[PDB]
RNA sequence: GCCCGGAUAGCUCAGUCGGUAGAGCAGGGGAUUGAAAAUCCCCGUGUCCUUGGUUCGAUUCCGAGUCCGGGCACCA
RNA sequence: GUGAGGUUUU
RNA sequence: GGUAGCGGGCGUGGAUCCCUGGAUGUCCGAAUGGGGGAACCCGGCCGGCGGGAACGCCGGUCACCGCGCUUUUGCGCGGGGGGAACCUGGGGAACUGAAACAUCUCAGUACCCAGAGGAGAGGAAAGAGAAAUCGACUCCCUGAGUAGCGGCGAGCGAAAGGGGACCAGCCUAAACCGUCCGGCUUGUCCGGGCGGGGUCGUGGGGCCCUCGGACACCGAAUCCCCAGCCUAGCCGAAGCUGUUGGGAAGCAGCGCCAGAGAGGGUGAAAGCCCCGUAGGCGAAAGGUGGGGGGAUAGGUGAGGGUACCCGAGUACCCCGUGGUUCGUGGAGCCAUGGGGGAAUCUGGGCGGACCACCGCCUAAGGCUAAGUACUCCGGGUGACCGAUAGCGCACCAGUACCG
RNA sequence: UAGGGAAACCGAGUCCGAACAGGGCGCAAGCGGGCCGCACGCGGCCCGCAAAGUCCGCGGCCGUGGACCCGAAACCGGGCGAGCUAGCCCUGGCCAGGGUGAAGCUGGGGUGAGACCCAGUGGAGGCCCGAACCGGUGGGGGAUGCAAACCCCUCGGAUGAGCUGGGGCUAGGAGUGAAAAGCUAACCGAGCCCGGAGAUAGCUGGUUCUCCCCGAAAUGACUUUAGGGUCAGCCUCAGGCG
RNA sequence: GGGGAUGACCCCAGGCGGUAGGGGAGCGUUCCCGAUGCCGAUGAAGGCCGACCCGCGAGGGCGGCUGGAGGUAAGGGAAGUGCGAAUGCCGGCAUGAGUAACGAUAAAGAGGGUGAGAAUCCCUCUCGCCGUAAGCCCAAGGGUUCCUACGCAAUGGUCGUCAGCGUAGGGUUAGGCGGGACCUAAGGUGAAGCCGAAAGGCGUAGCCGAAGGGCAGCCGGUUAAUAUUCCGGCCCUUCCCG
RNA sequence: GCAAAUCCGCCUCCCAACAAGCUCUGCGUGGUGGGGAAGCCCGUACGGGUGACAACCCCCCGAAGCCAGGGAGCCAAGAAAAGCCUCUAAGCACAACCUGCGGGAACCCGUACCGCAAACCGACACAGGUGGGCGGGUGCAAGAGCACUCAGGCGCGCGGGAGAACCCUCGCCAAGGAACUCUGCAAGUUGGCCCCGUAACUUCGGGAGAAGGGGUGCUCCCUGGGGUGAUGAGCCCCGGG
RNA sequence: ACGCUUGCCCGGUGCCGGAAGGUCAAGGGGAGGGGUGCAAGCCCCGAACCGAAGCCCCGGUGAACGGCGGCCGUAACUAUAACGGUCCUAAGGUAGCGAAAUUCCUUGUCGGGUAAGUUCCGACCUGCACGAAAAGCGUAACGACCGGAGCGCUGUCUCGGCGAGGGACCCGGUGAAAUUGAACUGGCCGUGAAGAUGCGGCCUACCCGUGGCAGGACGAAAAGACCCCGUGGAGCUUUACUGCAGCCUGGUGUUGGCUCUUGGUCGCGCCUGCGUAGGAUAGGUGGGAGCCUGUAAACCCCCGCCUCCGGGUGGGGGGGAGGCGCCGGUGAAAUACCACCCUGGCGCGGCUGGGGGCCUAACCCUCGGAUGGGGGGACAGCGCUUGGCGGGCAGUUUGACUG
RNA sequence: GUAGAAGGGGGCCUGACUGCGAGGCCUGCAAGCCGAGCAGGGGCGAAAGCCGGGCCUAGUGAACCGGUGGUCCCGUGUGGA
C-alpha cells in the first residue's frame, strides 16, 4: 500500500536474470536468458506515537520513521487532546 | 580453464609427516599330523605418474603438467 | 589364585 | 399526433403548429429513511383530511464520504452514476515475425480500473547541444528510415535545427515583521494558521545606509457591458394562347425577369404553377460571447556592508528497475524499491565511464488558456450506394426468434 | 552535378603500400553534330531537350500494412453460468407388507460361588424376500424413432455409505470428483460469449469477357530440408551488336 | 522486304497446335468531363423474340409485342467492372413421391339433433380401459390458455359445424388460508476494524434470508365462469377508546 | 447469570411424593344449523322438482394420523431466535400493567384454469421426466403386488378393406433334449403358503428357501381358543381331527 | 476384512544427522596498479584473507525409489549342490506358489471329466519374463463379474410348420426426408490410371409399371476414426532447457541495552628448537679470540618463564679470578660475543566476525471492562539483495535421407 | 607420375618472406586452385638459374560476439583516457 506521510508505491520491476561472465571480465558477455514481472513493495512498518489522546498505530517506510518523530514535534503546537480517537489520525498536514 | 587431494609387481594393498620397504593367488616339492585338510615354510612379477630441484641420498620432500575424479565456471 | 587358533577316520 | 371509423365540440375576441422560460413530473434506476428478488413492501418526526384515538392517504425531512462554521449537538459547499470516439495515470498479455524458438518484435497495442474535460496531457528550463548559440509548451511537414539499438538476426527507431498554426505567463514556502493559540522553564524562545514581505541565473532576495520622485505608466487568465452567433422565422422578379393526348410542362407563335437558368413536386420533359435558391430583414425570452471597449486585483528602480535564506531522508554513491533509439554495453540523463547520506552561492546539477578547464540552468511545491484528436447530435456536399447494396434495422429493430 | 577510404584525410584522383611497380573503385572516350574560328591540333557551334538528372501521369514487380479470397486444431484478457451434473451446509418429507431372531431380561439345571447350557421374552442389523422411489445386468425392438439416451421382459440395493423437495457455496489451467481425466447447461485431455482477430497455415478448394503473337520445365548447385525455397538452365517483352 | 503519292492501301517471302506463363489489340457494366446540351408519349430504361444487318469477338445496330419515364453520344477517365464450380452463401422450385409415416395393439358400434357439407361436433343405448390411476386436492411452473356468444383466414400429423384456434364481453372478492407489517439457520450484505496497484477482498454488532418456529375458521349453498374469501349458522384473534 | 433482581443455578427442608391439586391438547356428547341418495316426471343444454315430516340406529375391523414434549433400547449424541411466562435498571407511581363490561378499526400481494399433463421442462397436442397428501371394495396368509369393479374420467385425433412374402410381439408342436452357437444368449421349467428333511466346509453367525419331496378345491359334523361385546347370544382372527 | 510372514543387501537416488575437511555468491577487507589534474584532490580496478545455504565426503534409513547372476569339476551312465573356485557384484529371490488375468517355444508331460477337450481341474518345474505391503499363499459368507461340468425342462438346433394382433398390400385424406451433372442407364470378352451402362467386338432385349431381394452404380452419411507429412496445436512425464510460485540461507532496515570466551591483516613483546650419532634446552648459521668479569664469579645453590621432565634463558639478594669455547668431539651443521626470521605459550594497537547467558520498551501472541497485566523477545514476520533446492506451475525443443 | 629424380646420402640456409599480381581452370553464388612478372631485402650456386613450404589429390568451419600484441585512425565542447 501507500505510505500515510511521503506516498512510496508499491513498483512493478522486471527481474532480468541472466548468465555469462561480462565483455571486460571475461570471454563473450552476458546473455538474458528469462524476464519475469515482479512487484517491488516499500518498508511499510507500523509505529505507536503516544499523543496524550490516544496512542495512534500508524504505517511508515524506514527511509522516513525520523519523518515521524520528526513531525511529532510539527504536530505538536496543535490542538492536542481531541474529542476523538480518530480525528488525530488525518490531521497531520 | 583457476583452485583441491594421487596414480606403487596379472590383480590391489602394507608407505613418508626427508635417513624404511612389500605381504596374498593357476606354481613345484616340502618339520609337521601315525602317509589325510593346509593351519604353516622357501617363493614368479617396484621407471613407487613423466620429468627439474633444498638434499648424505630418493624406495618417500617440493614445481609444471601427459594420468583419473568432485565442486566451480566458461563455451562466440 | 590357572591353562585350547586346535582336528578329521585307515 | 401516425390514423383510419362512430360520436362531439374549437377558431380573426388570432385556433392548430414551432421556440424560450416556468409548474407538475407516479415508481425503479448514483437511489440516497430501511428492507428488497429493479419498476415492490415497511417506517420515524412535523402538519392536514376522512366520524379519526386505533386504519388509510397527502405535503416537507430522515443514506455515505471530504471540507468551513458550530467546543459534542447540527447548518451550509462539493463528490458518488452515466456518456459514440478522444486523452492521462496504474496493471497488462498471447497467436503471429524471426519460415522452430526462450532475449526481441507484435506492444506498452487490445483489454481492466480511477478521475477530469469539451478536449486531455504537458508547460515558463537544475532545458537543448557546440554556437559562446536557441530561448515556455503543444501539433504538422521536413530533417530521416539519418544517427543509433538489436540471438548486430528478425526488426525497432529518434533528437538537434528550420518553415509554419498558436503565443501568457504566473502563484506559494524560506530568511524579516504584527496578532492569536499550543507546550511550558510563562522564560525569551520553541511548534502551527493567518496579514505585509518573493519568485530568481545578468544570480535573486531578507536587514542597515545613500540616490527618490509617481500622486505617472502597464495590466489580466478575474469581473461588467456590448458587437456578433445559436434555439423560432419572414420578405423576396418574371406567361399566355392553340395542337396530339386522359393529362402539357412536349411541340408551334409572341413575349417577360435575372444579385434568382441550384434542387424537388406539379397526371409527362417548366427560369416565368408552387416551396425555396440570389439578396436583404428577424429576438420579447434563454444560452455562447475565444471578438471589441471599461474597472479591479496585481507589477513598478539603482550602489555599498552583512553571508541570514533560496523547496530533506532530497541531491550524491551502490544493488535491482522502466522510458529515451540504449536489451547491461564504455552506459549518460529523467523518475526510484532498498542501504549509506550533506551543503544554501567560495552551495549544486548538466554538456553520455571518468579527471581539469570552459559554457548552460537552479531540482527536490503548485496553476495556466490558444493552436492538436473525436463525432451521440445539426446542416451542406460526394466519378457514394440504390432494398442479397447501404449501418444489424430505408418497413413499429437490436424487434420477432435462439440461448 | 566527384568519388575513394573504416575513418582521419585526399581529390580526377583515392585506397592497399616505402614507392611514379602493380591492382580495385571512378575518370575522360560523342551522340543533333551550319561548328572552317579560315593554322585541318580547329578552339567548340545553327543546334536533337541529351549524354545528366529530376517532378507528375500510366503500367509490371516488390516491402511494410489483413494485402487474391474462403477455412482451422489452438493462445491470452475481461466476464457470464452449480435451475443440468459432482461435492457439501441449513431445513423438511419418503420408505407398503412378511421372515430369520443378536445384545440384554425372566425362569430352570450346575457347583461352595460362578463361568457354562436350555426354554420363554426381547426386536438390533451398511440382514433376507418384495412395492413407490432412485439405477440400468442381459436380451429384443427402436436407428431421418415416442425420444439429440426411449419402450417390453428379466434385474441389484430398497432402515440407509439411502432417495428427494426448498434456500444457498464452490468455476475454467479452475471447480468438483467412493478417481473415468468423468461432469461443469444435450460435444470437456482444460467450457461458453466478446475482443486481440480479417491470428497463422510453405495446407485443400475457387479465381469471372473476347481475339492475336511467341512459348516452358519437372534439370544442376545448396538449405533441422526433400509436397516449399535462393541462384543458374529453359520462356517472353523492350533496347543495343550484326 | 517492297510500290515507299508514308498507303494507316495493295504486291513478294516466311509463319499462324498449345498448359503454367510473357506481350499486344478490342467489347460490355456503375459513375464523372462533354451535360444550363441531345433523345424521349408520334413512347426512355428494362422484359420476350428475330430465319434481318455489321463485326474472327466480347458484342453493337434495326424490326415486332409488353412496359410506363427515364437514358445519354463522339472523344476520355476513375473502378465495389464481366461467375458455373470454392462439401460457397441467400431466396425460390424440383428429384426422392403421391412414397414412408399419421405418434403406445385400452376398442369401438348404432340411432337421433345441429349443419351446405359429420367415422371425428351435441344427446341417447350398448362394448372396452385406468381405477396406489389414465381419479381428486395443493406447492412448483406457465401467464388468461377459464366461461359465454359469433365464425373457420391460418393451426390440430385426416375432416371438423368442434377446439385449450381467431374476435368481443365477463370472470380471480380474505382480520381467521399462504406470505410482509414477527423471528432465525446455511448463506449473502454489512456500522467498527483488517488487508490489497485500482476494481475490490475478509469482517464483530446489526440486517436480509425458509416447504423451519409462532399466529385467530369449520360446515353447507350460490354462478356459465369465485370460494376455508360472497351468503346462512356458529366460534375466535390483534389494537385503540370510556 | 461478564449481575440491577423477590427470577434462575447451588446448599440446608418441618412436608407431599408411582399419587393428588393446578394448567395444555385430542375425542365423544352437547344449544343449533346444514346435507339427505338409488329410482321416477319435466328433460335442447344446464340440470330442476323429486320419494319423505325421509331414515339418520346398532355391531365389528382399524391406522403411518391425534393425546405427544408418551415408554423402552442404541450410538453415530441428535439447530437457532421470536411470540408467550417471570424478575428488575433508567423512568413512572394523577402514570403504567392485568381481567371484565360496551363501542370502534383490522392494512399490501396471491386467489381463474392445467398442475403427474395437450396449458410445466423437452423446436411439436412428444410412449420421456415433475415434489406432498387422500388414494375404496372383494379374493390370493398379508400388503401401495396381482385380477376385477365403486365415485371419477378415458377410447388415446387418421380410418375403411384384403388377410401376400417379410418385420415385431405372443401362443403351440411328433421324436431327440443344447446335438445350433464363442457361451442354456434368448426362451422354457421351478415359482406363493404349510409340513418332514437338508451335506462338503467354516471366522460357528452362515451355507440354507440347500438339495429333495407330500398337501393346497368344495360340502358336512365335532372341537381348542383369543379380541370386542356382559362372562356367551351376535361379530372378526388363529387353528386341529 | 481375516490365519501365517514382510527374509537379503544403503553401492546409485530420495530423506535424516554431522562444532573435522574441500568448493562457492552478495558482502567485508585490501597489498599492488590505471586515468586525470601544477599539485591538493576525484574516479576505476584489484590479487591475499574472512565469509552462510547448497554441492562433495561419513554414518543410518528398504511397510523409501530400486534391483536381486552366470561359469568349471566331483556320487554305480544320467542327475547333482548339500558341497569346492570367480564376480559389472552393494547383493545374488528366502518362505510360499507355479504353462498361472503371468509361458514365446506350447495344444510342454501325466491323470480326471468327454466316445472325441488348443478350454477346465490336480500335480511335475524345463519361472523367455511369480514373489513377499506396486504384498506372497489360502480362506466361511457374498458377487446383475469370468471360465468348466452335470441334472429336469425347453425350437436354440437337427427341420421347420401353423395360428393371432400391430405394420407391410389396396382405397379415401394430409403428406416430408437425406441424396441428386445431365441420362434415352443390358450381359460377356478385352482395352482404358491397372475392377466399364456409356470405349471396341459379339449376343440378348417392345414401351411403361406394381410387390419383394440388396449383387452393382468402387451406392449414402462423416473433407479416414488406421498410417505418413506439417519446422501444425494441445494433454501428460523427466536427472531436456529456462524462468516463476514456494522453501532454505548470508548481508541489511524494522532491531536495542549489557556480559563471557573465542576471530582476522594481526611482531611493539615473550623465549620457544632433545630421532639425533659425542659433554646438551644441539633452530638453520653471520662475525668466531674475543668477552661472562670486581658497576659482584664458579662444582650448583638464586628463580618468575615454558617444558618432550632432562633442563636452559630474565629480576641476580651472600659468593670471589674462576666459567671454556675457535681445533680435537658430533655431523646432513660448531656455539660461548652481536640475533635474521620460521617453530610458540602469550600482554594489545584496528574492526568485536561468529557462538552462548540476562534485561527489554521495538515487534508478535494473549487476558473480564485492554493508555493496563502475562509470555516470547531483538528472535519471528515483512522489504531489498545474494546463492542453492525446486515439473508444483508456465513457455518451449525433440532434425533429415529412407523402393 | 617418377631413376635423363620427385628417390637415398652430405654442405649452407630458412623464400615454411612482406606489399602486389597480369591471365586463367571451375563455379548459380559463396568458396577452392595455378600464377609469369614489379619493388624491398635475403638464402643456395662461380654463374646460368631456383626458392611466396612439403610429388600431387583428403587433413577442415562462412558470418557474428569477444581475448593478446602492434597501428596512434576516430574518440561526442576543449586536452587526455
Ligand atoms: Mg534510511
Ligand atoms: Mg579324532
Ligand atoms: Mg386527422
Ligand atoms: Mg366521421
Ligand atoms: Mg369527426
Ligand atoms: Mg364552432
Ligand atoms: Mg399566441
Ligand atoms: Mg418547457
Ligand atoms: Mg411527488
Ligand atoms: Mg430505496
Ligand atoms: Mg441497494
Ligand atoms: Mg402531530
Ligand atoms: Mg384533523
Ligand atoms: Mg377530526
Ligand atoms: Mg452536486
Ligand atoms: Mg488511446
Ligand atoms: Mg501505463
Ligand atoms: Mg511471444
Ligand atoms: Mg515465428
Ligand atoms: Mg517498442
Ligand atoms: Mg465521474
Ligand atoms: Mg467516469
Ligand atoms: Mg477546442
Ligand atoms: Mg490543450
Ligand atoms: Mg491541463
Ligand atoms: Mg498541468
Ligand atoms: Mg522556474
Ligand atoms: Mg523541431
Ligand atoms: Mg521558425
Ligand atoms: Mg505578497
Ligand atoms: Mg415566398
Ligand atoms: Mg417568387
Ligand atoms: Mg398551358
Ligand atoms: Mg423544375
Ligand atoms: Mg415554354
Ligand atoms: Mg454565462
Ligand atoms: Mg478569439
Ligand atoms: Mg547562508
Ligand atoms: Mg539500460
Ligand atoms: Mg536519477
Ligand atoms: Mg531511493
Ligand atoms: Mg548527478
Ligand atoms: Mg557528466
Ligand atoms: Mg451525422
Ligand atoms: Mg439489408
Ligand atoms: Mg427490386
Ligand atoms: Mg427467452
Ligand atoms: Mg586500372
Ligand atoms: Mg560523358
Ligand atoms: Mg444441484
Ligand atoms: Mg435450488
Ligand atoms: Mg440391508
Ligand atoms: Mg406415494
Ligand atoms: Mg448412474
Ligand atoms: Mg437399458
Ligand atoms: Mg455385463
Ligand atoms: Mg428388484
Ligand atoms: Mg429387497
Ligand atoms: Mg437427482
Ligand atoms: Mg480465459
Ligand atoms: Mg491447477
Ligand atoms: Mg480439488
Ligand atoms: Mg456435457
Ligand atoms: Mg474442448
Ligand atoms: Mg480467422
Ligand atoms: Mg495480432
Ligand atoms: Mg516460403
Ligand atoms: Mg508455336
Ligand atoms: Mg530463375
Ligand atoms: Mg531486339
Ligand atoms: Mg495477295
Ligand atoms: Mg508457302
Ligand atoms: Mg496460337
Ligand atoms: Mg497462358
Ligand atoms: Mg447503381
Ligand atoms: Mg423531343
Ligand atoms: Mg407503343
Ligand atoms: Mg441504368
Ligand atoms: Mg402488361
Ligand atoms: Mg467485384
Ligand atoms: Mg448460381
Ligand atoms: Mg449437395
Ligand atoms: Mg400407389
Ligand atoms: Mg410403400
Ligand atoms: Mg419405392
Ligand atoms: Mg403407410
Ligand atoms: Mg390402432
Ligand atoms: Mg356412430
Ligand atoms: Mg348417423
Ligand atoms: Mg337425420
Ligand atoms: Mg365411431
Ligand atoms: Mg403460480
Ligand atoms: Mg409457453
Ligand atoms: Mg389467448
Ligand atoms: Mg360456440
Ligand atoms: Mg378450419
Ligand atoms: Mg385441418
Ligand atoms: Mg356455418
Ligand atoms: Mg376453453
Ligand atoms: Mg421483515
Ligand atoms: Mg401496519
Ligand atoms: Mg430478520
Ligand atoms: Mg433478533
Ligand atoms: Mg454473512
Ligand atoms: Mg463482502
Ligand atoms: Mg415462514
Ligand atoms: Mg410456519
Ligand atoms: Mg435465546
Ligand atoms: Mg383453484
Ligand atoms: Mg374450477
Ligand atoms: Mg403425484
Ligand atoms: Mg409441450
Ligand atoms: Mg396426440
Ligand atoms: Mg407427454
Ligand atoms: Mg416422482
Ligand atoms: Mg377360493
Ligand atoms: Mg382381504
Ligand atoms: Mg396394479
Ligand atoms: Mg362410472
Ligand atoms: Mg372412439
Ligand atoms: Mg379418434
Ligand atoms: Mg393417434
Ligand atoms: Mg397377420
Ligand atoms: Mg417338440
Ligand atoms: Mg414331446
Ligand atoms: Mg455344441
Ligand atoms: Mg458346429
Ligand atoms: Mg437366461
Ligand atoms: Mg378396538
Ligand atoms: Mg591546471
Ligand atoms: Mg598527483
Ligand atoms: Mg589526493
Ligand atoms: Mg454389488
Ligand atoms: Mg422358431
Ligand atoms: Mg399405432
Ligand atoms: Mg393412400
Ligand atoms: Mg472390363
Ligand atoms: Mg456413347
Ligand atoms: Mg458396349
Ligand atoms: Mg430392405
Ligand atoms: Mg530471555
Ligand atoms: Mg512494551
Ligand atoms: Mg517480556
Ligand atoms: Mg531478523
Ligand atoms: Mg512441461
Ligand atoms: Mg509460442
Ligand atoms: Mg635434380
Ligand atoms: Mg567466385
Ligand atoms: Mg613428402
Ligand atoms: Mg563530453
Ligand atoms: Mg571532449
Known sequence: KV??????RPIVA???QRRGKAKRE???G???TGIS???QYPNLQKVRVRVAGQEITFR???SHI???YELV???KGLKLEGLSPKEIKKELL
Do not use: D, L, M, Q
Request: charge should be positive.
Open 14 to 16: 522486471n527481474s532480468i
Open 73 to 75: 514535534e510539527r504536530a
Open 37 to 39: 514481472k515482479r512487484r
Open 66 to 68: 525520523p519523518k515521524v
Open 30 to 32: 552476458k546473455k538474458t
Open 60 to 62: 511508515v517506510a524506514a
Open 26 to 28: 571475461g570471454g563473450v
Open 3 to 8: 505510505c500515510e506521510i511521503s506516498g512510496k
